[PDB]
Amino acid sequence: AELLSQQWEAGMSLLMALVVLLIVAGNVLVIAAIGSTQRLQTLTNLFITSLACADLVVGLLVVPFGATLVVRGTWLWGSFLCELWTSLDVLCVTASIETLCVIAIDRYLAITSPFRYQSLMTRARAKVIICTVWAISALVSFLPIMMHWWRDEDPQALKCYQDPGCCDFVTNRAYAIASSIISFYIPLLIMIFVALRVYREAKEQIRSRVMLMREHKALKTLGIIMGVFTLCWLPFFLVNIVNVFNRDLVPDWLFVAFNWLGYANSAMNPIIYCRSPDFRKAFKRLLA
């Protein structure tokens, strides 16, 4: 029994250490590549930097803390840090999906009014966009959490809030539905709708020719970013709505799983950016 625990503990700590490393390595690379390569300092890559920062926070903060939880079987860090950890978790997913929308809108704009785009998109304005995203994201994630709008009346739940070694995010139905809709479902819809317009206007372009194939590989890359993010988080967000209506329909282990799949997504973008010649050559440079 104490052997089964020691085996599991150490093998899990390892897998965990790996995912931390993969996320932090991958995203530092992306930030450095962009930071040190003028060729890669497009306005669009500013949003990528932002998205990589969200993933970076998941790597440095979110995953390590949740790893100690998954490994040791309790929250070691006390109540305040549990709330902060919970916030940083919600913040990141919110910032990611909002930044993806911005990216999709940037691309729709550049593809359908290259001239208006030219005289409306500047570095100074791209920074305002990024900050506004983080501002709205913080607004929507921190305040209700710090202000306890999320808590439940149930005595089983009240037992967990009092237990300083419990860090379970048991929420009332109102918050479950609300935060899901506000932080994920609405920007998910917006992003899809916009990304389908981008696809249309890109296919009503085909009918120099190499200039247009290079742009279309880049577009499809962003496409994959958005698709993969959706697959990594939608199963969690459906299961979240469903629990509000029936806690028996979907097994608990699968609810935990879908959340980790969510965290896993922060590892993926740097791999996907390898489709691009420039990133790949910058990745070889840096790693020496």
Ligand X SMILES: CCCCCCCCCC(=O)N(CCO)C[C@@H](O)[C@@H](O)[C@@H](O)[C@@H](O)CO
Ligand Y SMILES: CC(C)NC[C@H](O)c1ccc(O)c(O)c1
Ligand Z SMILES: CC(C)CCC[C@@H](C)[C@H]1CC[C@H]2[C@@H]3CC=C4C[C@@H](OC(=O)CCC(=O)O)CC[C@]4(C)[C@H]3CC[C@]12C
Told to check if 22 binds Na ion by CB under 5 A, we report: no
Of ligand Y, ligand X, ligand Z, none, which one sits near residue 172, judging by CB under 5 to 8 A according to partner kind? Answer: ligand X
The binder of ligand X chosen from 28, 138, 151, 278 (CB under 6 A): 151
CB of residue 219 to ligand Z, shortest distance in Å:
19
The encoded tokens of residue 256 equal 């935990």
Name which of residues 181 to 210 contact ligand Z (CB under 6 A): 182, 186-187, 190
CB of residue 101 to ligand Y, shortest distance in Å:
16
Here's the x/- map for ligand X, 122-141, by CB under 6 A: it reads as: ------------------x-
Told to check if 132 binds ligand Z by CB under 6 A, we report: yes
Task: Please give the radius of gyration of the chain, using alpha carbons only, rounded to the nearest integer.
Answer: 21
Told to check if 240 binds ligand X by CB under 6 A, we report: no
Told to check if 166 binds Na ion by CB under 5 A, we report: yes
Of Na ion, ligand X, ligand Y, none, which one sits near residue 149, judging by CB under 5 to 8 A according to partner kind? Answer: ligand X
Residue 89 assigned as binding residue: yes
Told to check if 94 binds ligand X by CB under 6 A, we report: no
Residue 259 assigned as binding residue: yes
CB of residue 233 to ligand Y, shortest distance in Å:
8
Stretch that binds ligand Y, among 41-49, 70-78, 178-186, 265-273 (CB under 6 A): 178-186
Q: What is the 3-state secondary structure (H, E, C) of the chain?
A: CHHHHHHHHHHHHHHHHHHHHHHHHHHHHHHHHHHHCHHHCCHHHHHHHHHHHHHHHHHHHHHHHHHHHHHHCCCCCCHHHHHHHHHHHHHHHHHHHHHHHHHHHHHHHHHHCHHHHHCCCCHHHHHHHHHHHHHHHHHHHHHHHHCCCCCCCCHHHHHHHHCCCCCCCCCCHHHHHHHHHHHHHHHHHHHHHHHHHHHHHHHCCCCCHHHHHHHHHHHHHHHHHHHHHHHHHHHHHHHHHHHHHCCCCCCHHHHHHHHHHHHHHHHHHHHHHHHCHHHHHHHHHHHC
Of ligand Z, ligand X, ligand Y, none, which one sits near residue 259, judging by CB under 5 to 8 A according to partner kind? Answer: ligand Y
Whole-angstrom Cα distance, residue 56 to residue 36? 18
The encoded tokens of residue 98 equal 């909002």
Residue 179 assigned as binding residue: yes
Minimal CB distance to ligand Y: which residue?
179
The encoded tokens of residue 108 equal 């729709």
Q: Are 263 and 63 in contact (CB under 8 A)?
A: yes
Stretch that binds ligand Y, among 18-26, 82-90, 103-111, 209-217 (CB under 6 A): 82-90
How far is C-alpha 108 from the geometric centre of its chain's CA atoms?
22
Length of the chain: 288
The encoded tokens of residue 273 equal 């950016």
Told to check if 161 binds ligand Y by CB under 6 A, we report: no
Told to check if 2 binds ligand X by CB under 6 A, we report: no
Footprint of ligand Y (CB under 6 A): 86, 89-90, 93, 169, 179-180, 183, 259, 262
Binding residues: 89, 179, 259
Footprint of ligand X (CB under 6 A): 140, 144, 148-149, 151-153, 172-175, 178-179, 182, 244-245
Footprint of Na ion (CB under 5 A): 166
Binding residues for cyanopindolol: 89, 179, 259
